[PDB]
């Protein structure tokens, strides 16, 4: 799985950071220290780390990912990483 998508809400200087969905890599989320949850009303699972999103981008570079692009949609800021 070469592509990877992380996002964060209201401010970028604080977590939590979304790092993956149902079909993500279980070893990679274990290296990032991710926990798994389902918010009420949602039909899907999601992984999250409590680190600020700058620290997660420094972890994911050591594994081999490079930031393609960044977007802001809504009140969310999304980074798209390619290996």
């Amino acid at each position: 799985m070469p592509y990877l998508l992380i996002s964060t809400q209201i401010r970028m200087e604080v977590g939590p950071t979304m790092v993956g969905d149902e079909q993500s890599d279980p070893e990679l989320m274990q290296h990032l220290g991710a926990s798994k949850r389902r918010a009420l009303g949602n039909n899907f699972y999601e992984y999250y780390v409590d680190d600020p999103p700058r620290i997660v981008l420094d972890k994911l570079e050591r594994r081999g990912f490079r930031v393609l692009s960044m977007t802001g949609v809504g009140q969310t800021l999304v980074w798209c990483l390619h290996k």
Partner: protein, 182 residues
């Protein structure tokens, strides 16, 4: 009931009343039956109430049921609070009947409650019944333990508000719910 009927009998003797006069003869037996009406929600269950009234239809657009009247009993001071409940949901190929949305509220408001807990329990009970795309609940209420006794703010009115599903994720779905209820 005879344990409650004796339990209000010790209250009337403790306040300096006389339980022997004509006004306070049936007062232990009429007030105790009104305390089992105000807490009769515990013997009710979601499955027994919905009564197989979940209808299959391709209508995926918003349904709002406003001005539902609740009447609850606070559990810190045992003094009532009354108000209105506003419920809206997005059905996902299954529509619930409009009476059962107002009969769910009768289950959870007829208990000893706290308004923050009362708001959340209706929205979770609608989620587990239908599996819809999103639920919203707004509850307005006036607490008689703030109007009559204590601080005595006769005009104060606490509002609480729970959004689940795509009422929480989508901001253009919550701005429509808050407009039609007005």
């Amino acid at each position: 009931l005879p344990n409650l009927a004796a339990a209000y009998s010790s209250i009337l003797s403790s306040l300096g009343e006389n339980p022997q006069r004509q006004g306070l003869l049936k007062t232990p037996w009429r007030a105790a039956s009104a305390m089992q009406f105000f807490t009769k929600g515990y013997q009710e269950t979601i499955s027994d109430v919905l009564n197989d009234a979940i209808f299959d239809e391709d209508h995926d657009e918003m349904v709002i049921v406003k001005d539902i009247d609740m009447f609850s009993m606070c559990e810190h001071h045992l003094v009532p609070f009354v108000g209105k409940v506003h419920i809206g949901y997005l059905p996902n190929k299954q529509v619930l009947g409009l009476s059962k949305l107002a009969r769910i509220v009768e289950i959870y408001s007829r208990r000893l409650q706290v308004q923050e807990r009362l708001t959340k329990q209706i929205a979770v009970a609608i989620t587990e019944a239908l599996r819809p795309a999103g639920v919203g609940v707004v509850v307005e209420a006036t607490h008689m333990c703030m109007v009559m006794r204590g601080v005595q703010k006769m005009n104060s009115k606490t509002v609480t508000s729970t959004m689940l599903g795509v009422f929480r994720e989508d901001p253009k779905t919550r701005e429509e719910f808050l407009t039609l209820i007005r």
